[PDB]
Nucleic acid binder design. Sequence first.
RNA 1: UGGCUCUGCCAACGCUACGGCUUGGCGGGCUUAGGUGGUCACGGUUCUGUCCUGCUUCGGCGAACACGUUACACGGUUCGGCAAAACGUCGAUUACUGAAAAUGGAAAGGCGGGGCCGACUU
RNA 2: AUGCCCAUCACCU
RNA 3: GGGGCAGGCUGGG
Lengths: 328, 122, 111, 111, 110, 109
Amino acid sequence: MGKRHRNLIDQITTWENLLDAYRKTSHGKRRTWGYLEFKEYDLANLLALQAELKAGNYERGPYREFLVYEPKPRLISALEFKDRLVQHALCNIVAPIFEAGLLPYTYACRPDKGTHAGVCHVQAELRRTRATHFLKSDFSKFFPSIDRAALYAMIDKKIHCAATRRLLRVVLPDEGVGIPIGSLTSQLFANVYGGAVDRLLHDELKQRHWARYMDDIVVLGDDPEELRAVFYRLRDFASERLGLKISHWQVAPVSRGINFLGYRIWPTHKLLRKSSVKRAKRKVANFIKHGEDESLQRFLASWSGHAQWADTHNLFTWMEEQYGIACH
Amino acid sequence: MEPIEEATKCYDQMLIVERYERVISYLYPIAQSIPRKHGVAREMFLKCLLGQVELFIVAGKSNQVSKLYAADAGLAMLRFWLRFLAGIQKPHAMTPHQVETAQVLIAEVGRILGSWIARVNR
Amino acid sequence: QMLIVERYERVISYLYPIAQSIPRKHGVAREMFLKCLLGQVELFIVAGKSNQVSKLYAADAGLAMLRFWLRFLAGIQKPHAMTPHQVETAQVLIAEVGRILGSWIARVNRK
Amino acid sequence: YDQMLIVERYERVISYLYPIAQSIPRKHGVAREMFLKCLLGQVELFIVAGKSNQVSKLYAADAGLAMLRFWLRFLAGIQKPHAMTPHQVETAQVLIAEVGRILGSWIARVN
Amino acid sequence: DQMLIVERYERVISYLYPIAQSIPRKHGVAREMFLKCLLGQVELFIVAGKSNQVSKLYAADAGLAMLRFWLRFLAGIQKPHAMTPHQVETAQVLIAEVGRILGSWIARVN
Amino acid sequence: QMLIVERYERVISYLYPIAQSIPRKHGVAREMFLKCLLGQVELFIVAGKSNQVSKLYAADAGLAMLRFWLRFLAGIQKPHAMTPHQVETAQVLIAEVGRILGSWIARVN
RNA sequence: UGGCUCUGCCAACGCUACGGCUUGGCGGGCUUAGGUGGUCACGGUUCUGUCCUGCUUCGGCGAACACGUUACACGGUUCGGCAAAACGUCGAUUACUGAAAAUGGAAAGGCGGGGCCGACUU
RNA sequence: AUGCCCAUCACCU
RNA sequence: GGGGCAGGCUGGG
C-alpha cells in the first residue's frame, strides 16, 4: 500500500481492532481462565491494553511454560489472554501487511491459504506443469531457528511504524534465534520468515511450482537435478540468511508422493499421510473398545473433514467395513 | 497491562457465567419473546434466567458450596422455566427446539455447576 | 422425590393459565400468586437438592400458600374471580402435590 | 476509608450506570430492574461489607461487582432495543474496575 | 395453629386488599409493597405453621407489624390519601386479631 | 422495635414525599428507593421481632443504604431529585433512627 | 415486556379524608459473529502372526492393505490467453521534500500470479 | 498453546 | 539381524 506502513501502532490499538483482537483471542478460548479473567472487565482491560500499546508500555507477560511432547517436542508455552490479545491486535494489522507479501504458494497461516489449499496447490501444480519430479524440504526446528533477527529485517522492511515495530519486538524480542512456537505473531512471523525462502524460490531461482506450508516446502520440477539445485540454493539461503537448518529434504520423483501437509500428493491422489490414518485407525479402534462410540462420531465427522480433501474414499469404505460407523 | 482482577477470581464461576451467558443469550430473546400476557412469568423467568448469573457469581465469590447448590437450584428452576415456557405458557414461549436448545445450554452450565460443586465438595 | 415437581407442574399448568388471567387490577396478587405458583418449583427444587426437611417444609408452606392463593383468588370478586370450580380443581392438583410432599416429608422424617 | 472510599468510587459507577440502567427500555425492564437492583444494590453490598469487615461480605461485594459486570455484558448483548452501548460497558467497566481495585485492596487489607 | 391465624388474617386481607388496591397509583410502590406485605404475610404465617423454628413465628409477627406499619404509613401518606384513618382502625382490629393469634401461637411454642 | 420505627416513620414521612416527587423517569429508582425507604421499616421491625444483631445490622445496612439513596437521589439521579438540604434533614432523621439503631446494636452486643 | 408515580373521559369491584382514589373499558401521550468438540502441523518394550528388506538424488522416502497405497477421475486442485491495471515483491523504510525522514514519501524499472479475460464446468 | 479445514449446536441476515 | 502393519503387556492419557 505504497509500501511503508509507517503508522500501524495507531491501527493496532484502534479500539475497533483490539475488540477484533479480543474477539479473535477469545474465539474458542471463551472457556479458559484467560478469557474469563479478561472477560470480567473486558473493555476496561482493552482500554488499558489499547493504552499500553498506544503508549508502548506494552510488555509481553510470561510465556506460560508448558509443552506437548508427542516425540516432536515443541515448547508451546502459552501466553496470557492479554498477551494473545496483543498478538491478535498486532496480527490483525501487522498480519495483512506481511501475508500480502507472502507469495501465493505459501499456503500456511494465511486466511484461506490453508493446509488444504496447500495440498490442493501442490496436487494442482503437480497436474499442471505435469511435474515429473519434486523437491520437498522441511526446516529442522523451524520456529526455534527463526533468526528472530533476520526475521526483524523482514518484519522491518514492511512495518516501518516504529511502535508497531516496538510492539512486534515486545511480542517477540529482536534478540534471539527462536520464535516461540504457538503465537499468532509467530505463525505469521514464521510464515513471513519462511516467506524469505518462498522469495528465493519464486523470485530468485524462479521456481513457479512450489508450495510452502510454514516450514515444509514442496518444489515440483521436471529435472530433479534442477530441484536438487533449487534445494541446495534453498538450504544455503535459509542457512546463511535465515539460520534455518533443513531437517529433511528429498527431490523424490513425483511418484514417491509429496508428503506435504500431512498428506501424500500425487498428480493423481492426495492420500493423507499414513500416520494420520494410523492415528485415526487406532483412535477409532480405541473408541470402539472403550465404549466411547458417541464421541467417535464427533471425531469421525472431524476426521472426515481432514480427509474429505484427501483421496480417502477407499479408506472411508474400509473403515466403514471394519467398524460400521458412518464415516462420510 | 494485566487484566483487571476481580477479586476472588474463581474459574468455575467465570466459566459457568460465560457459559450461562449463552443460556441467557439464548433464552433472553425468547424470554423477551414471551408475550405481554405471561409477563409476570416472563419477569419471573427473566429473574430466574438473568438472576442465575448472580447465583453463580455469589457462589464463586462467596466461595461457599451453599451458594453453589443454590445456583443448582436455580439452574433447576431455569430448567423448570424451560418446561413451563414450553408447555404451560399457553402461546408457546419456547419452541421444543428452543427448549431443546436452551436445555443444551443450561445442561452445559449444569455440567460446569456440577463439576464446580464436585471440585468444592472435595 | 421429583415426581413432586412433575406433579406440581400440573398445578402450574392448571393455575398459571388462571394466574395470568388475574387482571392488572389484581396485579400484585397475580405477581405474588405467580411467584407462589411458578416459584414453588424452586421450593421443590431446593427441597430435592438438599433432602433437608426444612426445604421440604418450605415447599409445603409454598403449597399451603398456593392453597391460600386459590382461596384468595376465589373471593377476589367481579369478573376476575378464580371460579369456584378452578379453586376446587386446582386444590385437587395441589392436593396431589401435597400428598407427594407429605410422603416426601414422611420419607425424610422416618429416615 | 475503605467502605466510604469504595462507595464514593462506586457512586461513580452508579452515577454512570444508573442513567444507562434508567435508560434500559421497559422491554428489558427485568434486566433494567435487576440491573438497577444490582447497581444501586451493590451499595448495600459494600455497606454490609463495611458493617462487618467479614471478608465474605466484601467477597459478596465482589460478587455484586461481578454481577454488575455481568449486567454490563448482558445489557450490551441484549439486541432487542439494546441497553448499554459497547462504549457504555467500556466506561462502566472502567468505573467498576476502580471499584474493583478498592474492593480488592479492601479484601487484602482484611486478609 | 397456622390455619386459624391465616383464616383470621384472610379477613385482614379481605378488608385491606380492596383498600390496598385503592391506594393511588401515585402511592403505587407503597401500595404494591403494602399488598405484598398484606398478601404475603399469609406466606409468613403459613411458613411459620408448616415448619417450626419460632423464628418463623416471629417473622410472621414482623410481617403483621410491618402490615400495621403499612396501615399507619398509608394513613396520611400524602395528599393522594391511600388509606383513610378509619380503614387503618378497622384493619388494625383485624391485624390485632391475627396479632393475638400469633402471640398465643408464639407463646404456645415458647 | 417501636421507637426506631417511629423515628424511621419520620424518615419515611420526610423521604416518601421526596421519593414521590422523583420523576417517572426515575420511577424505578423511586421504586427501588421506596423499597429501601418503606422496606427499611421491615428491616427495623424484623430486628425488633427476631432481635438478632444479624437482623439489626441489616437494618443498619438498610439505614446506610437509605443514606446512600439520599446521596443517590441527590445528584446521581440526574434531575438531582432530593435537594441537598433534604439529604441533610433526612440524614438527621436517618441518623436519629441510626443513633437508635446504634444504641440498639450496642444494647444487644 | 399485560407497563406509566398518565392523563382525559366514562363507567362501577370497591375504597372513600367526600376531594377523590381505585379499577375497568376507552382514546391520547410516555413507554454476520458465536459455541462446542475434534482435525492436521503419544509412546516404550518383548511376544504371536504376517509380510518387506523396496527405493535413494543418500537428505531420506517408502510397501504389506486406504490396496487400483488413490471415488484412477476430479475439486474450481478446470482449461487456454494475457499480465495493461490493481495486488505482491524487489527497487526502498530508496529518489524526492525537509536540518533531520522525523510514525512523510514516490516512481521508472525488474520479478511474480496472487491478478485479469474468455472457454468449459462448477 | 497457535494455526488449519471440517463437524455439530445455536442465531439473526 | 533390522523394519512396517494388527493383536500381547505396561505407562501416558
